Amino acid sequence: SIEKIWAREILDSRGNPTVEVDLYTAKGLFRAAVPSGASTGIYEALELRDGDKQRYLGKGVLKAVDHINSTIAPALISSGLSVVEQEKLDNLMLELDGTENKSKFGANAILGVSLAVCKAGAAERELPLYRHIAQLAGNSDLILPVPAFNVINGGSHAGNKLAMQEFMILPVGAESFRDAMRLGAEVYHTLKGVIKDKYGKDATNVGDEGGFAPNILENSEALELVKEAIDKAGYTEKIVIGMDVAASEFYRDGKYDLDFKSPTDPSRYITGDQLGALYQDFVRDYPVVSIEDPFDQDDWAAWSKFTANVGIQIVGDDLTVTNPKRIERAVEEKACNCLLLKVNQIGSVTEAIQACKLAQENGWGVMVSHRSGETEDTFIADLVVGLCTGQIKTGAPCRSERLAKYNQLMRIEEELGDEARFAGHNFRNPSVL
């Protein structure tokens, strides 16, 4: 049972306030924290902010913390329920909120508490978090995921002209996860040199996700750099490329703009038909095997088209916003074959696990993801393992809000011993391993 719940305001990796919760049980103290996004789809579970302009620019989260300490806490404590009952405790909060998008308490308030409970439940069962999570999702044989490092930030994640948002490297040819870390870290370091020597030292700083933010515009340039770093590191036959366009960030009047960070100019606009032609080039020119949000969150048409031709992975983000309703539609229209799992987009663990299953049962793939605004919390590490998704993207091997996850994953592999199995080339369908 829950003894005491106490939330507070801490700062995420961007310097903005976020929710953190301490949940007490006879087993001990369990703490968790909520991440925050920069490029958020309109259909995302509401994130409740204070709006007090004279404090943190209105980004404060004192209201969400109050809802937790003064309302949610006594509610879950009275329930007498044990922290092991994730599904029950989560519903109680959903019902108490009473809104569809968690607009009364905020998805950040409910999620914080949900995460803390999961951790407490695992302890009550004397099992590591990833084990408890697997039991909740109904899994048995855990599997370490292939990491997708965003080594080159763009869009709203970094200061530069680059339209597209993320350019990732996936060590599918690694021997294990620990080895995958070495490959990604090594390629990343080489990449720093390639950029320094080609664009100068003043271009080796990093963006919100730890990726380098050079001063360029061409989306193919970023792809050439990554391809070079990989080859220069001697991993052409082991590391592939993935990317997140985040078209919704530059959607303007039924036209995708590859230069939104620059003064508005309708002259430099392309249609979804054009935008898709570019990907067909990227997929053939570079070892790209995955493309997230290649179109706008409401451009269902283009999506179903692209997926019908390409044989690679098409990840939905703002299109599905980890929401069963939006997913049902995409599954129906075959708009994509992969789901990006963002827990704070749905607002609770229970729904996130249910959202993952919905994807998997439909033959889709699942990539657990962080938010551009992260914290030292490492929950998603045990999450991706417990759900056996086989793939996670939680930043470049730079900035600890990212490394915290990757380090925890290497510990999980260590903890599994011989039972540790790397997804590898089966990152899309690890159920065969």
Q: Which residues are designated catalytic?
A: 209, 342
At residue 420, the 3 state secondary structure works out as coil
Report what 39 binds from its own copies, Mg ion, none; CB cut-off 5-8 Å by kind.
Answer: Mg ion
- Cα separation, 64 vs 107, in Å, equals 9
Query: Helices 86-97 and 107-124: crossing angle, nearest 10°?
Result: 160
Which amino acid does the sequence have at 76? L
Contact between 186 and its own copies by CB under 8 A: the answer reads yes
Kindly state whether residue 120 participates in binding its own copies, applying the rule CB under 8 A.
no
Specify the residue, 102 or 370, whose C-beta has the smaller distance to its own copies: 370
Task: Identify the residue among 100, 175, 333, 414 touching its own copies (CB under 8 A).
Answer: 414
Name which of its own copies, Mg ion, none residue 403 binds, using a CB cut-off of 5 to 8 Å depending on partner kind: its own copies
List C-alpha distances in Å: 120 to 150, 197, 380: 32, 49, 15
Tell me, residue by residue from 339 to 378, as one string, x for binding to its own copies by CB under 8 A and - for no binding: -----------------------------------xxx-x
Report the partner that residue 74 touches, choosing among Mg ion, its own copies, none (CB closer than 5 to 8 A by kind). none
CA-nearest of 95, 113, 137 to 2 is 113
Is 157 marked as a binding-site residue? yes
Return the number of the residue (149 or 286) whose C-beta is nearest its own copies: 149
List all residues 6 or more positions away from 410 whose beta carbon is below 8 Å from its beta carbon: 177, 178, 181
Give one DSSP letter per residue of 293-342, joined into a string: --S-TT-HHHHHHHHHH--SEEEESTTTTT-HHHHHHHHHHT--SEEEE-
Q: Which of 302, 401, 416, 422 binds its own copies (CB under 8 A)?
A: 401
Chosen residue from 118, 181, 225, 412 binding its own copies by CB under 8 A: 181
Q: Binding residue per annotation — 3?
A: no
Which residue's Cβ lies closest to Mg ion? 39
Among 378, 361, 366, 359, CA closest to 341: 366
Helix, strand, or coil (residue 135): helix
Spatial strand order in the sheet of 17-25: 4-11, 17-25, 28-33
Evaluate whether 137 touches 383 at the Cβ level (below 8 Å).
no
Write the interaction track for its own copies spanning residues 256-295; mark x where CB under 8 A is met and - where it is not.
Answer: -----x----------------------------------
Residue reference for tokens 């993207």: 393
- Please give the annotated binding residues for substrate, written as ranges: 157, 166, 292, 317, 369-372, 393
- Please give the annotated binding residues, written as ranges: 39, 157, 166, 244, 292, 317, 369-372, 393
Residues that bind its own copies (CB under 8 A): 8, 10-16, 20, 55-57, 158-161, 181-182, 185-186, 188-189, 196, 200-207, 213, 215, 261, 374-376, 378, 396-401, 403-404, 406-407, 410-411, 414
